[PDB]
């Protein structure tokens, strides 16, 4: 996932960061202190950006032409996933975090099929 | 380009980094000092990674569904551009840097079309 | 610009980040939602910091003694540019982003003469 | 894992980075090209440093006084794990990457026991 | 401190970042402008994270088994120091930045005993 | 040092990174193993870059107009320091790291005079 290539990939890298995005969104409901709200905003932005990186790397570095041929929806799915993560950056609603997780789960499903 | 959105994008960010990758490749042919070679390798890797970020951000953040409809080749073009940049990371041959620049120029052409209509 | 040296320099790196800083200041005028305001503040701070790096690199790595002799005001101009970007970090007023852009344009003019 | 706290942690973050470190070490045995050796070294250093970060965060942020009471070996285990990752940075031998994986696995066992409850 | 090893370490790296965290907290008492409060929050988070890195590196990279033998309290001291810096991240109260500085001073004292 | 402003500055941040650069250069002379040499080059590049950041921040953020009038050589001194750091990046010779330290030492002397010392 480091572009050597090293051969090691797992959608879990993206997933755990998206899980933290949604967890932060949920915690925002639990404490109205402005400093806490701001820290949650700062950290959500950071973790969402890492998730985008992980998703992009799966698409550019792991997935190859036979995959794109077998899964003609994959390009669009990855774009949509990244856009969902942008939407979670901009929102305090955990529904936006969850949508991104749902998209990652669709990438994950394809990833492991290609590992069999 | 920063995902606010700020509304500010330009393929020149990707291009300048890809230009530095090819320049570094060229310079590796001009000085066989091992410490230089190593520094060149370190820096090429970093600038190529930055170019990959810039290209991915144009694809995810700038381009929108109407663009993917109008330019059905664009998803594959971006994927190929990123793969070209990984190949450049891997190589000292400036032809690899040039191939990445060639792909970015295809993206740049589409980008400025979308700025007009 | 990467200190190899690679021989590749362009004030456009600094300018585009400074353009984003001003753009973000403008955005802040059109959406008073605090979460958006907070995100804008985070991102403005990041883009301005990158702009400062690009301006510093031009000054330390690209420009050379003959340039400083020919343009005796360039050192102070670069320092002033960096201080304008700090002022943009601290402000929501797009005029501060514009002042930083105006300083970068003066560095850009000199840069291209040195070519 | 981000210090909010967000409450999300998994040793898998440290483990996947350590897996990439060992994989890089193995690949270094299969291609003696200097440019490749240099890239591998660069990237190993980066992924090992990320692994150290992940391990340090489990120790400082996830693990708490009752865990240090129940597992009195845990402080020294985490210190030993970080030193194993420094040793893997310094080595091309995949046994050093494996040793760090083996330490992480001890951390992971404790982690999941503390999650049972 | 770069893991070469280079042999160069100084708790001053952690200390100056912790001092900037406390200074930020103090500044937050002097200007309730939201924009300023937010920038202060951003920056405090970043400098505290750097302080944590510095402390962790002293522990993992500088200190060695003879030191952990002579100072059996050192592992918990470092853990306590990093928890104190997490607490400073979460707070505007300069008492929290000061507690982190107090813990760093205990690490500094041990550090220089081990150097002589 | 963080541009809040926080009011906290010390040229020691730059000094300790330049010390590590020089130390890395010394160690390079004592171990010609290719992997070691590559790691040393990677790290030297990183610490030198950090030193450049610290010096630049002193110049742009700590020092102010009255200081530039009192110390008319200060602008050129900071520029020369940054150039010396670039030269240390490019070199294995610890004399290059020492030259950067001597320039930092001149900035440090001015810094503490301005703190009123
Ligand atoms: Ni990898
Ligand atoms: Ni943007
Ligand atoms: Ni360059
Ligand atoms: Ni977290
Ligand atoms: Ni070091
Ligand atoms: Ni500061």
Query: Helical H runs in B59-93?
Result: 65-70, 74-89
Ligand having the closest approach to the CA of A17: 4
Residue positions counted in chain B: 117
Residue in C with minimal Cα distance to B8:
C20
Rounded Cα distance between F86 and A69, Å, is 48
Are B45 and D39 an interchain contact pair (Cβ–Cβ within 8 Å)? yes
Rounded Cα distance between C31 and C40, Å, is 10
Q: How many domains does chain A have?
A: 1
CA distances from D31 to C30, C40, D26, D37 (A): 56, 47, 10, 7
**In chain D, after which residues does the backbone break, taking C–N over 2.5 angstroms as a break?**
none
User: In this structure, what are the phi and psi dihedrals at residue E30, rounded to the nearest 5 degrees?
Assistant: -105, 5
Helix (H, G, I), strand (E, B) or coil at E9: coil
Q: Which residue among A53, A79, A86 places its CB closest to the CB of B59?
A: A79
Q: Determine the Cα angle at E78 with ends E72 and E84, to 5°.
A: 135
**Which H, E and C letters describe chain F, residue by residue?**
CCCCCCCCCCCHHHHHHHHHHHHHHHHHHCCCCHHHHHHHHHHHHHHHHHHHHHHHHHHHHHCCHHHHHHCCCHHHHHHHHHHHHHHHHCCCCHHHHHHHHHHHHHHHHHHHHHHCC
Are F1 and E13 an interchain contact pair (Cβ–Cβ within 8 Å)? no
Residue positions counted in chain D: 117
**In chain F, after which residues does the backbone break, taking C–N over 2.5 angstroms as a break?**
none
Neighbours of chain F (3+ CB pairs under 8 A): B, C, D, E
B71 HSE (CA, 13 A, CB side): 21
User: In this structure, what are the phi and psi dihedrals at residue C38, rounded to the nearest 5 degrees?
Assistant: -70, -50
Rounded Cα distance between D104 and D12, Å, is 9
CA distances from B6 to B50, C36, C40 (A): 19, 12, 9
Cα–ligand 6 centroid distance for E56 (angstroms): 21
Rounded Cα distance between B90 and E96, Å, is 48
Rounded Cα distance between A104 and B3, Å, is 19
Are the beta carbons of A15 and E66 closer than 8 angstroms? no
Cα–ligand 1 centroid distance for F114 (angstroms): 49
Of B30, B114, B9, B18, residue with least CA distance to B65: B114
Reading the block at residue F67, the tokens are: 């200081």
Are the beta carbons of A83 and A16 closer than 8 angstroms? no
Are D16 and A10 an interchain contact pair (Cβ–Cβ within 8 Å)? yes
Residue in C with minimal Cα distance to F74:
C75
Are B68 and A52 an interchain contact pair (Cβ–Cβ within 8 Å)? no
Our CA-based measurement puts residue F68 at a distance from the nearest CA of chain E, in whole angstroms, of 25
Angle of helix B74-89 versus helix B34-57 axis, rounded to 10: 170
The DSSP code for E3 is S
Reading the block at residue C58, the tokens are: 């031009």
Of C46, C24, C43, residue with least CA distance to C97: C24
- Chain B residues closer than 8 Å to C8 by CB: 16, 19-20, 23
Neighbours of chain C (3+ CB pairs under 8 A): A, B, E, F
Rounded Cα distance between B108 and B63, Å, is 12
Residue B64 backbone class (left: φ over 0; alpha: ψ -120 to 50; beta: rest) = beta
Please name the residue that has the structure tokens 């059905």. Answer: B72
Residue of E8, E17, E27 for testing the chain F interface, max F β-carbons within 10 Å: E8
Rounded Cα distance between E5 and A22, Å, is 39
Ligand having the closest approach to the CA of E21: 6
CA distances from E18 to E84, E99, E104, F12, F16 (A): 10, 10, 8, 15, 17
- Burial degree of B72 (CB within 10 A; 0-12, 13-18, 19+): exposed
Rounded Cα distance between F103 and E48, Å, is 29
CA distances from B19 to B24, B30, B94 (A): 9, 17, 10
Secondary structure (DSSP) of A59-82:
IIII--HHHHHH-TTHHHHHHHHH
- Chain F residues closer than 8 Å to B36 by CB: 90
Our CA-based measurement puts residue C34 at a distance from the nearest CA of chain A, in whole angstroms, of 9
Of A41, E63, D62, residue with least CA distance to C37: A41
Are A10 and D27 an interchain contact pair (Cβ–Cβ within 8 Å)? no
Reading the block at residue C65, the tokens are: 């003694």
Rounded Cα distance between A12 and A92, Å, is 23
Element (H, E) at D40: helix D34-57
Q: Rounded to an integer, what is the distance from CA C23 to the centroid of its chain?
A: 13
Resolution (angstroms) equals 1.3
Residue in D with minimal Cα distance to F38:
D38
Rounded Cα distance between E15 and D15, Å, is 31
Are the beta carbons of F75 and F68 closer than 8 angstroms? yes
Rounded Cα distance between D9 and D64, Å, is 13
Are D4 and A40 an interchain contact pair (Cβ–Cβ within 8 Å)? yes
Reading the block at residue F54, the tokens are: 């610290």
Secondary structure (DSSP) of C74-88:
HHHHHHHHHHHHHHH
CA distances from A12 to A60, B93, D35, E46, F50 (A): 17, 35, 31, 26, 32
Are E2 and F46 an interchain contact pair (Cβ–Cβ within 8 Å)? yes
Q: Can you give the C-alpha Rg of chain D in angstroms?
A: 15
A49 HSE (CA, 13 A, CB side): 15
Cα–ligand 3 centroid distance for A115 (angstroms): 39
Cα–ligand 1 centroid distance for A1 (angstroms): 3
Secondary structure (DSSP) of E87-108:
HHHT---HHHHHHHHHHHHHHH
Reading the block at residue E55, the tokens are: 């402390």
Please name the residue that has the structure tokens 């440290």. Answer: D14
Q: A9 is in which domain, residue-wise? A: 1-116
Q: Can you give the C-alpha Rg of chain F in angstroms?
A: 15
Experiment type: X-ray
Find residues 14-73 of chain A whose CB sits inside 8 Å of chain B: 49, 52-53, 56, 59-61, 68
Cα–ligand 5 centroid distance for E49 (angstroms): 18
- Chain A residues closer than 8 Å to B76 by CB: 68, 75
> How far is the first Cα of chain F from the last one, in angstroms, to the nearest whole number?
20
C20 HSE (CA, 13 A, CB side): 28
For residue F116, count other CB atoms closer than 10 A to its CB: 5
CATH number of domain containing A109: 1.20.120.400
Q: Rounded to an integer, what is the distance from CA D9 to the centroid of its chain?
A: 14
Q: Which residue among C3, C52, C68 places its CB closest to the CB of F86?
A: C3
Are the beta carbons of A51 and A81 closer than 8 angstroms? no
Q: Which residue among F6, F12, F23 places its CB closest to the CB of E20?
A: F6
Of F74, F91, F89, residue with least CA distance to F17: F89
Chains D and B are touching, with contact defined as 3 or more CB–CB pairs separated by less than 8 Å = yes
B73 HSE (CA, 13 A, CB side): 8
Are E61 and D86 an interchain contact pair (Cβ–Cβ within 8 Å)? yes
Reading the block at residue F87, the tokens are: 């030269």
F68 HSE (CA, 13 A, CB side): 17
Q: Determine the Cα angle at B6 with ends B5 and B9, to 5°.
A: 105
CA dihedral F75, F81, F85, F88 (to 10 degrees): 150
Rounded Cα distance between C36 and A90, Å, is 7
Rounded Cα distance between E89 and E71, Å, is 28
Rounded Cα distance between E82 and E63, Å, is 16
User: In this structure, what are the phi and psi dihedrals at residue C108, rounded to the nearest 5 degrees?
Assistant: -60, -40
Find residues 77-116 of chain A whose CB sits inside 8 Å of chain C: 89-92
């Amino acid at each position: 996932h480091c572009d050597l290539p090293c051969g090691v990939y797992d959608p879990a890298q993206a997933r755990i960061e998206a899980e933290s995005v949604k967890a932060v969104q949920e915690k925002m409901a639990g404490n109205d202190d402005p400093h806490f709200q701001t820290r949650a905003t700062v950290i959500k932005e950071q973790r969402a950006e890492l998730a985008k990186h992980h998703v992009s790397v799966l698409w550019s570095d792991y997935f190859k032409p036979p995959h794109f041929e077998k899964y003609p929806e994959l390009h669009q799915l990855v774009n949509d996933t990244l856009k969902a993560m942008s939407a979670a950056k901009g929102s305090k609603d955990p529904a936006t975090g969850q949508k991104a997780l749902d998209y990652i789960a669709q990438i994950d499903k394809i990833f492991w099929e290609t590992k069999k």
